[PDB]
Amino acid sequence: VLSPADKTNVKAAWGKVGAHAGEYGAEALERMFLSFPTTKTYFPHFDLSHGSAQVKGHGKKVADALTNAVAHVDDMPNALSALSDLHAHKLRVDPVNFKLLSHCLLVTLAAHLPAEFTPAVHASLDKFLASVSTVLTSKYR
């Protein structure tokens, strides 16, 4: 689980991103759709177009789910049970895809906050997203 320092880093990053949460979430998705087109086959009836509003809207849902994860770092399995059901049972998302979105969340972060994206923070955010990703694919276990 996340150390006290890791918790502090993730929140610091969460506080600093603040209002841009939904936007960063839409960008990470656009980034994922473009770098790993295979991921698009999960959003068929979606306008995966650029300025897409459906993407803008899913970005926000993703960022909100993440904010919820941040508020239950020591609870997550619980707090995400529903989401874990959606993605694992009903959607059958290939677990590799979680590494790909997470990797894209980090690029987005890194690109908008070059100076704060130090190796330690990178490390803390990476552990966090992997905790989130592991909870979401937990219904396969």
Partner 1 sequence: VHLTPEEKSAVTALWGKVNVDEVGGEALGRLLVVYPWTQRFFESFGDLSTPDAVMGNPKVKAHGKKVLGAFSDGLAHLDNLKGTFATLSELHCDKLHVDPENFRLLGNVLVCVLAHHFGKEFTPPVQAAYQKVVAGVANALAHKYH
Ligand X SMILES: */[SH]=c1/[nH]nc([C@H]2COc3ccccc3O2)[nH]1
* Contact footprint for its own copies (CB under 8 A): 1-2, 127-128, 130-131, 134, 138-141
Contacts of 43 (CB under 8 A, 6+ apart): 33, 54, 58
CB distance 125 to 13 below 8 Å: yes
Among 9, 84, 108, 133, binds ligand X (CB under 6 A): 133
Please report how close the Cβ of residue 60 comes to partner 1 at its closest, in angstroms.
18
Annotated binding residue 58 = yes
Residues within window 24-53 making contact with partner 1, judged by CB under 8 A:
27, 30-31, 34-38, 41
124 vs 98: CA distance, rounded Å: 17
CB distance 59 to 140 below 8 Å: no
Which single residue is written with the structure tokens 């803390």? 124
Which single residue is written with the structure tokens 């790909």? 100
Secondary structure (3-state) at 90: helix
Binding region for ligand X (CB under 6 A) out of 11-19, 56-64, 66-74, 132-140 = 132-140
96 contributes a contact to ligand X by CB under 6 A:
yes
SS3 content of the chain, % helix, strand, coil (to 5): 75, 0, 25
* Contact partner, 63, from ligand HEM, its own copies, partner 1, none, Cβ < 5-8 Å per class: none
Binding positions for O2: 58
Task: List binding-site positions.
Answer: 58, 87
Positions that interact with ligand X (CB under 6 A): 95-96, 98-100, 102-103, 106-107, 126, 129-130, 133-134, 137, 140-141
